[PDB]
C-alpha cells in the first residue's frame, strides 16, 4: 500500500488526485466548468517503483480495476486483438466508474514506421484500436487509464497529447540520496534487525540503486543469517550483501567485450 | 454531441465540405440543370490534435442524413473472406436510406500500400471497397452515397483511394495561426469563471504553432493550478506558466550532438 | 448503362474488345471464312484513372447477350471447401445461359504467385485459383463464354493463367497523350456554357502529368467554383485555378534536373 | 531496429546518412567519463579508471598522454585504439610541421592532422 | 544478419563479436598457469596434460625463451603461439641493432599488442 | 532486388539511385545564401547548432577561403569537405607559379567538380556529398557566382541558396529581388530569409556569419571582409529584426 | 492428465540412492524444505520464502533426477516446459503457453516447474531481425510479469535448468529472485565408485569390482556412461551365457564405450 | 532474375543489361538533332528556360567544339559527358603534334568509342551515361558527315538523327521529309528543315533553343536569338490556318 511505499513523496500525490478525487469530488471541477483528464503515463527505468504504486491504488480505489500487460493483446489469428481491446473498454464503461492499468506498452506504443510486413503492420492497428476509442465519436466520462513503461521517448506523439494523456509523470534516477536513506529505514523497520545497525554507513556510498535491488540485498542478507540456524536478527557483517549486490562484476560482456 | 460553434479555428475548409455534401442533397436541380457530375466523398489530412475527428462528429449534428461510422479496424476479421462480406453488407444498408453519409476515422490500418510477402485479407477487402465505390453497381451506389475519411499522413496509402473519380477533394488541416489559436481558448474557456483582468492574445503569440488540442490541455491544466488552492477563479500568470512548461518537454529530446555533418 | 460516344480517346485499345465480343455475335462468318475461331479471353492492364471498368460497362449496354457482375473477392468463402465449387457453378450456368460473358475485377486479390505459405487460410484461395484453371482450359472445352478480367498491377502478379488457352490479348492503358486530351475534354464539357473563353489547346498540355479521370473533377470543380461567384456559366480562369489545385501533388521532379 | 544500411559505410540511405559511424559513437558513450575545462590561464583534463582486476599496476597505463611539451590529450572510449593513435599522431607533428617549419605545431594544425588519420579509415568498406 | 562473420563491423549497441569469440577461444586446452614476482626475480609455472602415451614430453611446451632476460607463457592453441613467439624472436634483433640495447618486456608487449590491434 | 547497394549500377528505369541519396544529404545541413549585384558579392550562413559551451565566435565553419580573390560557402559532410578545399588551395597556386598570374574562377570549379565525378564511377567508393557555393571575380567575365552539386555539374547563378528549406527561401527571393541593388538591398533581403525559414527564434549573432567581395580597390584588384561578430550584431539591430 | 506426470507427490525415488553430492542437495534443503517444514522463522522475520534457482552445467550431472526426487521428498508436482519445445513461430502463442501453466499450476494446489534448455529464452540477439527479436523479448518479458505478480503462495516453486550459463546476455535477470545459483560439479574420480555402487546393486555377479574403473571413467565423467556400461557389461556376461559378471567386462566396458563419450 | 546487376555477365538470352539501361537514361535527356546539306551542316538543342536567376551573360551550351573543324553534341547527363570531351580535344591536338596533320573525323570518332568500349568491358567501372554525335568536315575537302556514338561503343554515320525526349517523333518525321532524292544545298533550308523538326518538343517556347552550323576551311558560326525569331515566324507563316 501507500505506507508500504518509501520515497515517492512527490509522485504519490498526482495520481491519488487524478484518480480518486474526481469520483469523490467532481462537481467542483465543473464548478469551474472544465472537463477533467482521462489518461496518465508512468515512465522511468525499472526498479524505480512504478508497478507497485497502482497496486497500492488497487487496495484503495472503491472502483473497478483491470490488469492487462501489453503482451497479452496479440494472438496468431488477426482481427481478434482489437475486438479483445474493444471488449475491454466496453467492460469498463459498463462497470463504471472504472479505470484500467497496463504494465507495459513498449511492445505496442511505438513510432508507427513505414511497414512492409504483416507482423509490423498488425501491431499498428492494435494501437489504432486504442486511439479510435480514447478519442473518437463515442467517448465517456468514467474511464481513466494508467499506462506504464520502463521508458517513454519513442511511442508515437499521436498518443501523447491532451485528451489522451493529460498528466504524465517522471520517476527518479538511481543516484539520489534522500530517498535512499528513506527506503532502508522503511524496509528494515518492517521487521526486526540488530542494534549494531550500520545503515548510516551504506547510504553514503556513491553507488546507484533502485527499489528492486534493495529488496534483493535486504532479503538475501536476511537469507544468510536465517540460514545460520538463527532466529531473527541480521548481523552487522552483511558486508557480503552489498558487495554481493555488484552485478557489473558478473557481466563478462561488461568486462572483456568492447576491448 | 458537439456543434459548429465549437470547431472554430477556420472557415475555409468547412466552407468546402458542404460545398459537396449539403448542396447535392438539398439542391441538385441546379446541378442537374447544369447537369455535369456528382462530386462524391472527401478526405482530410493533417497532423494529430488538430480537429479532424471533431468536425466529423459536429457534421452529424448538422446533417439531416444518416451518418454511419466505422472506428479503427472493426472490419479486419479472423476468418477469411467475410471482411469483404462485412463491407458489401454495409453499403446495401446505406442505399436503403438513399441520403447516407459514411465515415471511417482512419485508413492507414487498412488502406496501406500493397505488397505480396505479407498482408492478406486486409489487402483484399480494400480491393473490393475500391470496387464498390466506382464499379458497375457502384455507379448505382455512386448516386447519393458520400464518404469521409480522416488519415494522418497520406503518402503511405495507395493513390487508388485518393484517386479522383471518388475522392474529389483533399483537404489540409494544418496547425493554426495566432488568431485561430487565440479564439479556441475562448471556446474551451467561456465556461470557466469571470476571469479577472485578462488578455489571451498576448499568450497565443507566445506559443507559436504547435497544435490545437494542446490548447485544451493548458486551459484545463491552468484551472487545476487554481483548483488545488481552492482558488476557484483564474489567473493570468498561470497561463504563460503552463504553456511555457508543457511544450518544454516536447523540446527536450529534440536535441542531439551526433553531427557527422554541418 | 453508359454507351460509346462517351470516351472518344481509346481507339487503338478499343478495336479488340470489338473483335472479341461485340462483333462475333454479329458476323462470325468472317472468322470462319479464314477457318478461325475468336479469342476466349481478354485482360486489361492497370495504370489507374484511365477507364478500364468504364469500357466493360459500355459493351454491356449493347451486347444482346447475358452479362455478369463479379469482383475478385466474391469468389472466396469461409467454410474452406465451398469456394471452388462456386466457380464451377458460375461457368456451367453461363453455358446453360450461353452465349454469355463474365467480368472478374481486381483479381489481384486472387491472383498471386504460389507463395507456399504456412497460414491455413491463404491455401484455400490457391485451390480456388486452381479449379478456375482446371475449369477454364483444364481438360475439356467450355463453349462461347468470354472473360473480360481487369486489374491495376500485373508486373509481378497473375502468374500462369495469363497465357493463351485462357487469355489471348492484353490491352493496356496509361495516362493519355496530348492528342487524346483534346477530344476527351469535349466529352464532359458538352453540356456547359463555355461563355467565350475556350483556348483549350493550351489549357491541356504536356507536362500536365495528369490522368484521364481527373479532368472531370477539374470540369466539375470549376462550375461550382464559379457558382459560388453567382455566375453559373464559365470562363477560362475558372479552370486555371482548378488545374493549379488538382495537379499539385501528383509528382515532383526534385530528383530530375540532373540529366542536363 | 535498423537494417540493410548499417552493414557497411559506403551506401547512403534514402534518408541520407552513412552506415555505422553513427554506431561507432555508441561505444564512445559506453566508455568511462571524461572532461576538460578552459580557464583564462590554463586548461585541465581528467578521467577515472574502473580497473577490472585490482592486482593491475594502474600506474602503467595512462589515459592521458603526451603529444608535445605543450599539448596533451585524453579519450573517452575504446582503449587500444588510442595508444596507437598517439604514435601515429606525434609522428606527424615531426615530419609534417616541425622539420619544414623548425618548431612545434599549434594545436589545430596538430588536430587537423589527427582527423586525416581518422577519415582514412572511413574511406572504404 | 552479418555483424558476426566480419571483424570491422560494429553492432548498433557498440560491441563487436568476433574478437569476443577469440577471447573465448583461449581455453581449448583446459590449461591454467600462474606467475608471481619475487625480490629480484620472477617465476612462471604451467600445468601439463599429455594423456596419450607416445609424446616425448620434453618438447611439448607452451614456453618460448625468446631471448636473454625474457620469457613468455601462452594460452590458446599452440600453433598461433609459435606464430607470435617468432615475431618476438625477430624484434629482439632489431631493437638491439637499431636502438642499441635489449628490449624491456613492457615495450615488447606494447609493440606486439599493436600488431594484434591492426588485425 | 533494388538498385542501390553500389554506385556503379544504372537502374532499369535509367538512373543511379545512390547519387540521389547523396544530393539529399545536404538537406540535413545548414543554410547558405549568395547574392550577386553591382558593387560586389555577398554570402550568408547558418550554423546547424548554436549551443553555449562551444565557441563559434572566432571559429568559422561555413565560410572557408581559397584565395584573396575567391571565397566559398560549404555544406554537407565535414570530413569530405576539407579535402576539397585543401585541393582547391593547391590547384590555384599550381596555376599561379606556372602562368605567373591569378586563376580564372571557371577553371577551378571545372577542375574541382570533375573529381567528384571521379568518385562516382571508377571504384566502389563514396561520392563526396558537398554543395559548395563559389564567389569571386575574374577579368574575362567580371564578377561571378557558381554553384556545385555532388554529381559534378555546376551552374552560373545570380542569387541562390542551399541547405535546409531552400525551396521556400527561393520563393522568398525569386519575386522580391532587383538587379540594381547595391549591397544593402541584398543584406536585408538575405537576413530576412534566414529569419523566416529557421528552426528556432534566436537569430543570435553566433548563429550566422556573412562575407563580402568588393571591387572597392581603386584600380587595385579586390578586397574581402569576413565579418567578426561586432560587425553583424550591430547591423541586424541596425536593420530591424 | 494432459501435460506431465506430476509424480502424485509420493512416487518415492531415492534422492540418496545416488552418487551425487551432499553439499548441493543440502544447499537446496534450505530454500525448499526449511520453510515448508519450518515457517516459524521466515514468519518471525517476515521475509517471504525464496524465488527459484538455477542449476547450470552440462549433462551427466543428473541435474533433473535430483529435482523430481527432492520434490518427491516434500511431495510437489513435477512437470516440464522445455523451451526448445515451447517456441512457436506465431506472434503470440509462445506467451500463451506461459500463461496456461502458471494458471494450471495454480489449478493444482502445489506445483513446481522444471524448465530446461532455457537459453532458447535468453538469446544474444545477434541476428536482430526486429520482426522476430522484438517478439522474443515480448514472450520473455511476459514471463517476468507472469511469474511474480500477485502470487503470494508458498507452494508454487520454480526451477530453471540452463546448460551453457552466461550465453544469455540480453538480460541476466539477476536482481531479486534466483536466491541461489548452485555451483554444479562434475563426477569426480572419487565419485565413480560412489556412482558404480548405485547401479551395480540389484545384481548377482560375483562382485564385479575394480580400481581400474575411475581411470576408465576418467574424462567419461557422465552418469549416462555408468548407466550404459552397467548395461552393456551386463550384455557381455550373457554374450557367452555366463552366470555372473567378471570385473574385466567393466574394465572392458568403460574403456571401450567412453570412446563415443569422448570423441562425439 | 539477378542477371542485370553487373557488366561482366550474360543473361541467357545472350545480352548484357547495364549497357542498354543507359539507353533508358539517355532517353530522359534533351534533344540533339543534326543534318548535313550538300555543303553545310547544322546542329540543334532543346535548351531550357528554367528560371530568371541564371546569368543571361552566360547561357549554357550543350555544344562544345574540340578543334576548328569539328564539333560535338550530346544528351544524357553532363558530368560523364564533360570527360570524354576533354579526352577528345586533347587527343586531336596530339595528332596535330605527332603527325603534323589534322584529324580525319573517323579517327576521332573511334577514340571516343574506344573508351566507351573499355569503360563497360573491364568491371570496377560504370559506363558513360551519354550518347553523342560528331559533326564537321574533313580537311581539304567539302565532304559532309556526322557520326553517332553510344555507350555500347559503336559508331555509325547517319545523315539525320536525334537523341532524347520524343526522338521517336522526330526520327520518323525527317524520314517523311528529308531524303537523299533531294539533298539540301545551303543553310536557310537545312535550318528551315531543322527548326520545324524541334517543334514536337518545344511547345512554342523560343527562349528554349540554340543552334549552330559549319564551314569548310576550318571555320564555324554560331547564331543569335532574333536570327531564329524570324525563323520562328516563316515556319509559322505557312501555318496560317
Ligand atoms: N480547432 C479545434 N476546435 C475544437 N477542438 C479542438 C480543436 N483542435 C483540437 N481540438 C481538440 O482536440 C481533440 C481532437 O483531436 P483530433 O480530432 O485533431 O485528433 P484525431 O483526428 O481524433 O486523431 P485520430 O482521428 O487520428 O485518432 C478534441 O478533444 C478537441 O476538442
Ligand atoms: N475517356 C474517358 N471519358 C470519361 N471518363 C473517363 C475516361 N477515361 C477515364 N475516365 C474516368 O475514369 C474512371 C474509371 O477509372 P478506371 O476505369 O481505372 O476504374 P477501375 O476500372 O475501377 O480502375 P481503378 O480501380 O484503377 O479506378 C471513371 O470514373 C471515369 O470518370
Ligand atoms: N520504494 C520501494 N520500496 C520497496 N520496493 C520497491 C520500491 N520501489 C521498487 N521496489 C521493488 O521494485 C519492483 C518493481 O519494479 P518496476 O520498476 O515497477 O518494474 P516494472 O515497472 O517493469 O513492473 C517491485 O517488485 C518492488 O519490490
Ligand atoms: N550423480 C549421478 N549418479 C548416478 N547416475 C547419474 C548421476 N547423474 C546422472 N546420472 C544418470 O544420468 C541420467 C540423468 O541424465 P542427466 O544428466 O540428468 O540429463 P540432463 O542433464 O539433461 O537432465 C540418470 O538416468 C542417471 O542414470
F34 → chain H, closest CA residue: H53
Judged by DSSP in three states, B14 sits in helix
Chain D stretch 80-99, residues whose beta carbon is closer than 8 A to a beta carbon of chain A = 80
Contact G38, G63 (CB under 8 A): no
Q: CA dihedral in degrees (G119, G125, G130, G132; nearest 10)?
A: -20
Rounded Cα distance, F39 and F183, in Å: 7
Tell whether F67 is within 8 A of chain C (Cβ).
no
G113: left (phi over 0), alpha (psi -120 to 50) or beta: beta
- Burial H64-101, CB ≥16 within 10 A → b, else e: ebbbebbbbbbbbbbbbbbbbbeebbebbeebeeeeee
Check whether A48 is labelled as a binding-site residue: yes
D–G interface: beta-carbon pairs under 8 A: 4
Q: Determine the distance in angstroms separating the CA of B258 from the nearest CA of chain D, rounded to an integer.
A: 7
> Does G26 contact ligand 4 (Cβ within 6 A)?
no
Do C105 and B135 make contact, defined as CB atoms within 8 angstroms?
Answer: yes
Which residue, G227, G119, G135, is CA-closest to G173? G119
Which residues line the pocket of ligand 3, CB cutoff 6 A? Answer: A 5-6, 46-52, 103, 150, 183, 187, 211-212, 215
Chains H and G touch (3+ CB pairs under 8 A): no
Contact F39, F214 (CB under 8 A): yes
> Does C48 contact ligand 2 (Cβ within 6 A)?
yes
Instruction: Chain B: list its partners (3+ Cβ pairs within 8 Å).
Output: A, C, D, F
Measured in angstroms, the resolution is 4.3
Judged by DSSP in three states, E88 sits in helix
If interface means Cβ-Cβ distance under 8 Å, which residues of chain E face chain A? 14-16, 20, 23
Check whether C143 is labelled as a binding-site residue: no
B233 Cβ partners below 8 Å, 6+ apart?
A: B193, B194, B195, B196, B226
Contact H74, H128 (CB under 8 A): no
Check whether C53 is labelled as a binding-site residue: yes
Please spell the DSSP secondary structure of chain A, one letter per residue.
Answer: -TTT--S-TTHHHHHHHHTHHHHHS-HHHHHHT-----EEEEB--TTSS-HHHHHHHHHS-SS---B--GGGS--SSTTHHHHHHHHHHHHHHHT-S--EE-S--TTTSS------SSHHHHHHHHHHHHHHHHSSSS--SS--EE--BS--SSS-TTTSSTTT-SEEE----S--HHHHHHHHHHHHHTS---SS-TTTTTTTS-----SHHHHHHHHHHHHHHHTTT--S---S--HHHHHHT--STT-GGGTSS--
Secondary structure (H, E, C), chain D: CCCCCCCCCCCCCCCCCCCCHHHHHHHHHHCCCCEEEECCCCEEEECCCCCCCCCCCCCCCCCCEECCCCCEECCCCCCCCCCCHHHHHHHHHHHHHHHHHCCCCCCHHHHHHHHHHHCCCCCCC
D12 → chain F, closest CA residue: F21
Do H51 and F14 make contact, defined as CB atoms within 8 angstroms?
Answer: no
Q: Kindly give the number of the ligand 3 atom that is closest to the alpha carbon of A179.
A: 1
Do C260 and F153 make contact, defined as CB atoms within 8 angstroms?
Answer: yes
Please spell the DSSP secondary structure of C120-147, one letter per residue.
Answer: SSTHHHHTHHHHHHIIIIISS---SEEE
Residue to substitute in C52, C56, C104 for testing ligand 2 pocket (most ligand atoms within 8 angstroms of CB):
C52
Q: CA dihedral in degrees (A14, A19, A25, A29; nearest 10)?
A: 70
Q: Which three cell numbers stand for residue C255?
A: 530528383
Check whether C220 is labelled as a binding-site residue: no
Tell whether C255 is within 8 A of chain F (Cβ).
yes
B–F interface: beta-carbon pairs under 8 A: 24
Rounded Cα distance, B5 and B20, in Å: 21
Instruction: Chain G: list its partners (3+ Cβ pairs within 8 Å).
Output: A, D, E
Integer-rounded Cα radius of gyration of chain H: 19
Taking 3-state DSSP, the helix, strand and coil percentages for chain G, each rounded to the nearest 5, stand at 45, 5, 50
Contact D62, D19 (CB under 8 A): no
How far is the CA of F132 from the CAs of A255, C232, F150, F156, F213, in angstroms?
46, 55, 9, 13, 17
Do C216 and B37 make contact, defined as CB atoms within 8 angstroms?
Answer: yes
Q: Which three cell numbers stand for residue B42?
A: 472527401
Which residue, G214, G205, G223, is CA-closest to G261? G223
Which residue, G128, G123, G126, G112, is CA-closest to G164? G123
Which residue, H81, H109, H117, H87, is CA-closest to F120? H81
Q: CA dihedral in degrees (G34, G39, G41, G45; nearest 10)?
A: 120
Way it was determined: cryo-EM
Amino acid at each position: 500500500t501507500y505506507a508500504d511505499v518509501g520515497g515517492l513523496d512527490m509522485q504519490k500525490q498526482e495520481i491519488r488526485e487524478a484518480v480518486e478525487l474526481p469520483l469523490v469530488q467532481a462537481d467542483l471541477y465543473e464548478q469551474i466548468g472544465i472537463d477533467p483528464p482521462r489518461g496518465v503515463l508512468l515512465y522511468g527505468p525499472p526498479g524505480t517503483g512504478k508497478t507497485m504504486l497502482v497496486k497500492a491504488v488497487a487496495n484503495s480505489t472503491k472502483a473497478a480495476f483491470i490488469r492487462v500487460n501489453g503482451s497479452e493483446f496479440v494472438h496468431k489469428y488477426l482481427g481478434e486483438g482489437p475486438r479483445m481491446v474493444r471488449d475491454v473498454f466496453r467492460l469498463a464503461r459498463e462497470n463504471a466508474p472504472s479505470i484500467i492499468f497496463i504494465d507495459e506498452v513498449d511492445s505496442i506504443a511505438t513510432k508507427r514506421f513505414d511497414a512492409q510486413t504483416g507482423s509490423d503492420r498488425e501491431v499498428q492497428r492494435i494501437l489504432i484500436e486504442l486511439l479510435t476509442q480514447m478519442d473518437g465519436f463515442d467517448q465517456s466520462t468514467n474511464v481513466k487509464v494508467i499506462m506504464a513503461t520502463n521508458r517513454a521517448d519513442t511511442l508515437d506523439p499521436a498518443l501523447l497529447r491532451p485528451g489522451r494523456l493529460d498528466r504524465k509523470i517522471e520517476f527518479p534516477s538511481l543516484r539520489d540520496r534522500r530517498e535512499r536513506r528513506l527506503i532502508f529505514g522503511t524496509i528494515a523497520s518492517k521487521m526486526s534487525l540488530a542494534p549494531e545497525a550500520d545503515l548510516d554507513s551504506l547510504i553514503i556510498r556513491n553507488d546507484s540503486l533502485s527499489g528492486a535491488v534493495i529488496a534483493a540485498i535486504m532479503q538475501e542478507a536476511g537469507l544468510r543469517a536465517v540460514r545460520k540456524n538463527r532466529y531473527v536478527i541480521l548481523q552487522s557483517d552483511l558486508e557480503e550483501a552489498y558487495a554481493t549486490q555488484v552485478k557489473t562484476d558478473n557481466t563478462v560482456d561488461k568486462f572483456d567485450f568492447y576491448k | 454531441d458537439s456543434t459548429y460553434d465549437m470547431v472554430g479555428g477556420l472557415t475555409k475548409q468547412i466552407k468546402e465540405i458542404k460545398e459537396v455534401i449539403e448542396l447535392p442533397v438539398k439542391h441538385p436541380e441546379l446541378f442537374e440543370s447544369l447537369g455535369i457530375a456528382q462530386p462524391k466523398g472527401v478526405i482530410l489530412y493533417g497532423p494529430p490534435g488538430t480537429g479532424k475527428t471533431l468536425l466529423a462528429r459536429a457534421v452529424a449534428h448538422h446533417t439531416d442524413c444518416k451518418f454511419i461510422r466505422v472506428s479503427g479496424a472493426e472490419l479486419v476479421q479472423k476468418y477469411i473472406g467475410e471482411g469483404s462480406r462485412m463491407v458489401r453488407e454495409l453499403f446495401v444498408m446505406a442505399r436503403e436510406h438513399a441520403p447516407s453519409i459514411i465515415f471511417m476515422d482512419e485508413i492507414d490500418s487498412i488502406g496501406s500500400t500493397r505488397v505480396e510477402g505479407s498482408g492478406g485479407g486486409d489487402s483484399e477487402v480494400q480491393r473490393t471497397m475500391l470496387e464498390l465505390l466506382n464499379q458497375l453497381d457502384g455507379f448505382e451506389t455512386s448516386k447519393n452515397i458520400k464518404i469521409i475519411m480522416a488519415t494522418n499522413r497520406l503518402d503511405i496509402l495507395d493513390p487508388a483511394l485518393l484517386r479522383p473519380g471518388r475522392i474529389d477533394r483533399k483537404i489540409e488541416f494544418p496547425p493554426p495561426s495566432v488568431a485561430a489559436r487565440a479564439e479556441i481558448l475562448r471556446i474551451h474557456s467561456r465556461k470557466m469563471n469571470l476571469t479577472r483582468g485578462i488578455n489571451l492574445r498576448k499568450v497565443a503569440e507566445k506559443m507559436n504553432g504547435c497544435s490545437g488540442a494542446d490548447v485544451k490541455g493548458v486551459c484545463t491544466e491552468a484551472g487545476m493550478y487554481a483548483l488545488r488552492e481552492r482558488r476557484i477563479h483564474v489567473t493570468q500568470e498561470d497561463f504563460e506558466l503552463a504553456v511555457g512548461k508543457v511544450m518544454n518537454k516536447n523540446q527536450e529530446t529534440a536535441i542531439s550532438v551526433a553531427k557527422l555533418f554541418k | 448503362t453508359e454507351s460509346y460516344s462517351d470516351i472518344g480517346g481509346l481507339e487503338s485499345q478499343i478495336q479488340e474488345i470489338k473483335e472479341s465480343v461485340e462483333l462475333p455475335l454479329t458476323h462470325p462468318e468472317l472468322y470462319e471464312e479464314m477457318g478461325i475461331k475468336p479469342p476466349k479471353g481478354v485482360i486489361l492492364y492497370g495504370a489507374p484513372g484511365t477507364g478500364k471498368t468504364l469500357l466493360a460497362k459500355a459493351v454491356a449496354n449493347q451486347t444482346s447477350a447475358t452479362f455478369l457482375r463479379i469482383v475478385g473477392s466474391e469468389l472466396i468463402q469461409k467454410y474452406l471447401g465451398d469456394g471452388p465449387r462456386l466457380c464451377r457453378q458460375i461457368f456451367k450456368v453461363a453455358g446453360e445461359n450461353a452465349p454469355s460473358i463474365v467480368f472478374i475485377d481486381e483479381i489481384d486479390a486472387i491472383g498471386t504467385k504460389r507463395y507456399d505459405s504456412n497460414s491455413g487460410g491463404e491455401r484455400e484461395i490457391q485451390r480456388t485459383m486452381l479449379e478456375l484453371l482446371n475449369q477454364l482450359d483444364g481438360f475439356d472445352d467450355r463453349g462461347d463464354v468470354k472473360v473480360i478480367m481487369a486489374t491495376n498491377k500485373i508486373e509481378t502478379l497473375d502468374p500462369a493463367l495469363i497465357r493463351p488457352g485462357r487469355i489471348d490479348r492484353k490491352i493496356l492503358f496509361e495516362n493519355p497523350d496530348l492528342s487524346t486530351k483534346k477530344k476527351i475534354l469535349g466529352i464532359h464539357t458538352s453540356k456547359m456554357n463555355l461563355s467565350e473563353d475556350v483556348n483549350l489547346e493550351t489549357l491541356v498540355t504536356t507536362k500536365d502529368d495528369l490522368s484521364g479521370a481527373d479532368i472531370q473533377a477539374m470540369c466539375t470543380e470549376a462550375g461550382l467554383l464559379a457558382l459560388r461567384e453567382r455566375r453559373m456559366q464559365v470562363t477560362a480562369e475558372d479552370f486555371k485555378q482548378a488545374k493549379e489545385r488538382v495537379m499539385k501533388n501528383k509528382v515532383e521532379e526534385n530528383l530530375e534536373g540532373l540529366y542536363l | 531496429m535498423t537494417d540493410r544500411y548499417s552493414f557497411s559505410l559506403t551506401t547512403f540511405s534514402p534518408s541520407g546518412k552513412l552506415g555505422q559511424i553513427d554506431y561507432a559513437l555508441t561505444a564512445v558513450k559506453q566508455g568511462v567519463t571524461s572532461l576538460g575545462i578552459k580557464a583564462t590561464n590554463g586548461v585541465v583534463i581528467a578521467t577515472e579508471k574502473k580497473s577490472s582486476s585490482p592486482l593491475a599496476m594502474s600506474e602503467t597505463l595512462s589515459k592521458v598522454s603526451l603529444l608535445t611539451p605543450d599539448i596533451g590529450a585524453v579519450y573517452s572510449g575504446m582503449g587500444p585504439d588510442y595508444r596507437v593513435l598517439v604514435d601515429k599522431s606525434r609522428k606527424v607533428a615531426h615530419t609534417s610541421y616541425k622539420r619544414i617549419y623548425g618548431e612545434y605545431p599549434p594545436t589545430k594544425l596538430l588536430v587537423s592532422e589527427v582527423a586525416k588519420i581518422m577519415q582514412e579509415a572511413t574511406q572504404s568498406g | 544478419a552479418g555483424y558476426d562473420r566480419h571483424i570491422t563491423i560494429f553492432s548498433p549497441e557498440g560491441r563487436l563479436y568476433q574478437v569476443e569469440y577469440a577471447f573465448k577461444a583461449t581455453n581449448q586446452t583446459n590449461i591454467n598457469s600462474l606467475a608471481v614476482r619475487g625480490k629480484d626475480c620472477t617465476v612462471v609455472i604451467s600445468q601439463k596434460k599429455v594423456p596419450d602415451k607416445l609424446l616425448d614430453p620434453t618438447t611439448v611446451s607452451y614456453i618460448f625463451c625468446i631471448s636473454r632476460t625474457i620469457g613468455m607463457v601462452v594460452n590458446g592453441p599452440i600453433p598461433d603461439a609459435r606464430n607470435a613467439a617468432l615475431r618476438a624472436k625477430a624484434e629482439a634483433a632489431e631493437f638491439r641493432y637499431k636502438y642499441g640495447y635489449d628490449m624491456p618486456c613492457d615495450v615488447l608487449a606494447k609493440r606486439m599488442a599493436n600488431l594484434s590491434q591492426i588485425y | 532486388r533494388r538498385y542501390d547497394s553500389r554506385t556503379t549500377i544504372f537502374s532499369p528505369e535509367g538512373r543511379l539511385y545512390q547519387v540521389e541519396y547523396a544530393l539529399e544529404s545536404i538537406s540535413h545541413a545548414g543554410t547558405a545564401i549568395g547574392i550577386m549585384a553591382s558593387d560586389g558579392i555577398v554570402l550568408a550562413a547558418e550554423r546547424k547548432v548554436t549551443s553555449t559551451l562551444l565557441e563559434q565566435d572566432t571559429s568559422t565553419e561555413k565560410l572557408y577561403k581559397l584565395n584573396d580573390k575567391i571565397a566559398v560557402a560549404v555544406a554537407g559532410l565535414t570530413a569530405d569537405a576539407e579535402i576539397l578545399i585543401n585541393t582547391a588551395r593547391i590547384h590555384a597556386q599550381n596555376y599561379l607559379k606556372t602562368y605567373n598570374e591569378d586563376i580564372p574562377v571557371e577553371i577551378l570549379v571545372r577542375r574541382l567538380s570533375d573529381i567528384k565525378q571521379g568518385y562516382t564511377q571508377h571504384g566502389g567508393l563514396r561520392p563526396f556529398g558537398v554543395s559548395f557555393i563559389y564567389a569571386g571575380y575574374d577579368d574575362r567575365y567580371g564578377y561571378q557566382l557558381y554553384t556545385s552539386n555532388p554529381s559534378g555539374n555546376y551552374t552560373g547563378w545570380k542569387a541562390i541558396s542551399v541547405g535546409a528549406n531552400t525551396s521556400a527561401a527561393q520563393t522568398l527571393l525569386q519575386m522580391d529581388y532587383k538587379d540594381d541593388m547595391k549591397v544593402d538591398d541584398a543584406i536585408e533581403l538575405a537576413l530576412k530569409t534566414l529569419s523566416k525559414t529557421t528552426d528556432s527564434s534566436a537569430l543570435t549573432y553566433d548563429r550566422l556569419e556573412f562575407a563580402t567581395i568588393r571591387k572597392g580597390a581603386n584600380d587595385g584588384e579586390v578586397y574581402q571582409k569576413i565579418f567578426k561578430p561586432q560587425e553583424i550584431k550591430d547591423i541586424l539591430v541596425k536593420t530591424g529584426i | 492428465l494432459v501435460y506431465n506426470m506430476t509424480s502424485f507427490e509420493q512416487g518415492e525415488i531415492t534422492f540418496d540412492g545416488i552418487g551425487g553430492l551432499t553439499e548441493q542437495i543440502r544447499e537446496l534443503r534450505e530454500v525448499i524444505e526449511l520453510p515448508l517444514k519450518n515457517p516459524e522463522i521466515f514468519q518471525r522475520v517476515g521475509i517471504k520464502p525464496p524465488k527459484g534457482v538455477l542449476l547450470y552445467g552440462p549433462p551427466g550431472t543428473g541435474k533433473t533426477l535430483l529435482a523430481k526426487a527432492v520434490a518427491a521428498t516434500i511431495g510437489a508436482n513435477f512437470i516440464f516446459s522445455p523451451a526448445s519445445g515451447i517456441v512457436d513461430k506465431y506472434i503470440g502463442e509462445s506467451a500463451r503457453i506461459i500463461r496456461e501453466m502458471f494458471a494450471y499450476a495454480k489449478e493444482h494446489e502445489p506445483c513446481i516447474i522444471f524448465m530446461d534448455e532455457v537459453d532458447a529464452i535468453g538469446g544474444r540477439r545477434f541476428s536482430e531481425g526486429t520482426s522476430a527479436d522484438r517478439e522474443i523479448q515480448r514472450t520473455l518479458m511476459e514471463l517476468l510479469t507472469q511469474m511474480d505478480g500477485f502470487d503470494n503462495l508458498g507452494q508454487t516453486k520454480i526451477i530453471m535448468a540452463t546448460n551453457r550459463p552466461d550465453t544469455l546476455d540480453p538480460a541476466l535477470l539477476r536482481p531479486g529472485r534466483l536466491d541461489r545459483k548452485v555451483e554444479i560439479p562434475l563426477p569426480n574420480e572419487a565419485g565413480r565408485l560412489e556412482i558404480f555402487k548405485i547401479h551395480t546393486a540389484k545384481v548377482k555377479k560375483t562382485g564385479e569390482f575394480d580400481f581400474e574403473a575411475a581411470v576408465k571413467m576418467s574424462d567419461g565423467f557422465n552418469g549416462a556412461d555408468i548407466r550404459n556400461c552397467a548395461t552393456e557389461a551386463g550384455f557381455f556376461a550373457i554374450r557367452d551365457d555366463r552366470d555372473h559378471i567378471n570385473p574385466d567386462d567393466l574394465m572392458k566396458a568403460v574403456r571401450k564405450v567412453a570412446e563415443v563419450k569422448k570423441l562425439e | 532474375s539477378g542477371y542485370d546487376r553487373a557488366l561482366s555477365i550474360f543473361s541467357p538470352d545472350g545480352h548484357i543489361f547495364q549497357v542498354e539501361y543507359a539507353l533508358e537514361a539517355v532517353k530522359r535527356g534533351t534533344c540533339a538533332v543534326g543534318v548535313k546539306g550538300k555543303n553545310c551542316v547544322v546542329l540543334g538543342c532543346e535548351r531550357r528556360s528554367t528560371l530568371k536567376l541564371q546569368d543571361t551573360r552566360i547561357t549554357p551550351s550543350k555544344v562544345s567544339k574540340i578543334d576548328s573543324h569539328v564539333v560535338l553534341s550530346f544528351s544524357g547527363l553532363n558530368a560523364d559527358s564533360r570527360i570524354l570531351i576533354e579526352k577528345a580535344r586533347v587527343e586531336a591536338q596530339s595528332h596535330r603534334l605527332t603527325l603534323e596533320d589534322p584529324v580525319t573525323v573517323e579517327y576521332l570518332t573511334r577514340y571516343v568509342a574506344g573508351v566507351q568500349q573499355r569503360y563497360t568491358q573491364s568491371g570496377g567501372v560504370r559506363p558513360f551515361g551519354v550518347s553523342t554525335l560528331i559533326a564537321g568536315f574533313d580537311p581539304r575537302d567539302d565532304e559532309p558527315k556526322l557520326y553517332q556514338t553510344e555507350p555500347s561503343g559503336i559508331y555509325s554515320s547517319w545523315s539525320a538523327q536525334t537523341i532524347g525526349r520524343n526522338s521517336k517523333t522526330v526520327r520518323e518525321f525527317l524520314e517523311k521529309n528529308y531524303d537523299r532524292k533531294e539533298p539540301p544545298a545551303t543553310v536557310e533550308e537545312c535550318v528551315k528543315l531543322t527548326v520545324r523538326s524541334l517543334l514536337e518538343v518545344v511547345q512554342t517556347g523560343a527562349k528554349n533553343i540554340e543552334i549552330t552550323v559549319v564551314k569548310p576551311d576550318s571555320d564555324i558560326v554560331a547564331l543569335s536569338s532574333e536570327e531564329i525569331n524570324q525563323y520562328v515566324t516563316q515556319i509559322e507563316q505557312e501555318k496560317q490556318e
